[PDB]
Amino acid sequence: LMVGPNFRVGKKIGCFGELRLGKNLYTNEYVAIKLEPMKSRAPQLHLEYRFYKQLGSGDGIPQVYYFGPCGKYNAMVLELLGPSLEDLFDLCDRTFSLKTVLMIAIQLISRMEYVHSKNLIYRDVKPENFLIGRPGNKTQQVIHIIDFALAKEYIDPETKKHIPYREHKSLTGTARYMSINTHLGKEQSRRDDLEALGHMFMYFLRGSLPWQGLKADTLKERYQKIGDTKRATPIEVLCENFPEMATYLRYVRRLDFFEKPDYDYLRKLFTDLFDRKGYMFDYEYDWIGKQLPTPV
Ligand SMILES: [Cl-]
Numbered sequence: 001l002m003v004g005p006n007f008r009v010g011k012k013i014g015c016f017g018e019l020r021l022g023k024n025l026y027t028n029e030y031v032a033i034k035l036e037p038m039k040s041r042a043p044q045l046h047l048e049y050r051f052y053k054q055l056g057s058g059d060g061i062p063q064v065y066y067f068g069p070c071g072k073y074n075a076m077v078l079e080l081l082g083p084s085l086e087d088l089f090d091l092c093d094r095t096f097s098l099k100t101v102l103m104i105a106i107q108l109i110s111r112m113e114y115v116h117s118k119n120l121i122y123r124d125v126k127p128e129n130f131l132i133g134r135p136g137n138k139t140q141q142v143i144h145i146i147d148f149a150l151a152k153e154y155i156d157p158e159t160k161k162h163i164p165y166r167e168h169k170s171l172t173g174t175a176r177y178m179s180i181n182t183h184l185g186k187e188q189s190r191r192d193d194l195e196a197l198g199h200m201f202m203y204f205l206r207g208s209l210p211w212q213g214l215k216a217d218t219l220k221e222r223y224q225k226i227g228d229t230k231r232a233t234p235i236e237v238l239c240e241n242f243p244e245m246a247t248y249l250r251y252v253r254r255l256d257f258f259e260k261p262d263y264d265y266l267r268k269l270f271t272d273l274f275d276r277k278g279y280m281f282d283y284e285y286d287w288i289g290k291q292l293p294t295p296v
């Protein structure tokens with residue numbers, strides 16, 4: 001029924017546990033309640049909360065309100081957001097205008113810059129993890145990054161050194177947007193968040209990516225096929241008609257493991273495009289004036 005003093009648990013609104021609609025009874029505000037069975041054999045909720053705390057208050061970071069026990073679950077109470085870019089992607093007939101994608105990209109490079117500024121790498125880029133604010137809120141226009149369960153501190157706290165390079169890192173997440181180097185079992189760094197973004201920007205522009213249908217008998221082999229197709233798809237072909245996207249992807253693909261990405265350059269690739277195309281950054285995304293779903 002209740003999370004901590006004041007948060008009432010509500011209906012299931014999503015599915016390592018479930019997401020519930022919650023209400024702060026003390027403020028009359030709806031909230032998100034991410035639950036996780038206490039009997040989880042591989043818990044992620046507490047480490048995710050810890051990453052959220054580490055992120056603090058950022059533009060497009062979901063506020064977090066409570067982490068505590070909830071019957072036979074552990075609960076994390078955070079800010080209730082709207083649809084994901086994937087949900088929105090579907091409402092927009094699985095393509096987005098260049099303006100939508102550019103407004104998304106400009107934002108999410110800054111979102112990613114911020115995450116990286118807090119000594120974290122994200123490692124779970126995917127449209128489903130980028131949520132607009134709520135249908136009426138001051139933040140419906142803002143694309144928020146969620147789900148920090150797969151994040152990593154890429155700067156070691158004691159030494160203040162970048163994490164060392166390594167390989168034979170096993171593959172587990174979403175294969176569709178992951179960097180080529182993630183496919184090669186390399187330790188992910190800041191570059192890989194940014195490349196995965198580029199893949200997703202291309203997914204949005206094209207409607208699909210050319211490795212998105214690939215199936216294999218094991219998942220290891222499927223990652224391999226997808227990775228092979230990524231390597232075998234020239235950026236110039238993947239990004240035909242989108243020159244700055246190819247420029248973005250080459251840049252991020254060529255980043256050294258340790259290299260701090262030049263976020264300003266990448267953002268300017270896109271803001272110059274945006275300007276040149278005659279676009280106005282007015283948050284008038286493709287899905288504006290559509291019937292968007294609600295959590296509540
Ligand atoms: Cl009430």
Ligand SMILES: [Cl-]
Pocket residue numbers: 174175176177
């Ligand atoms: Cl996939």
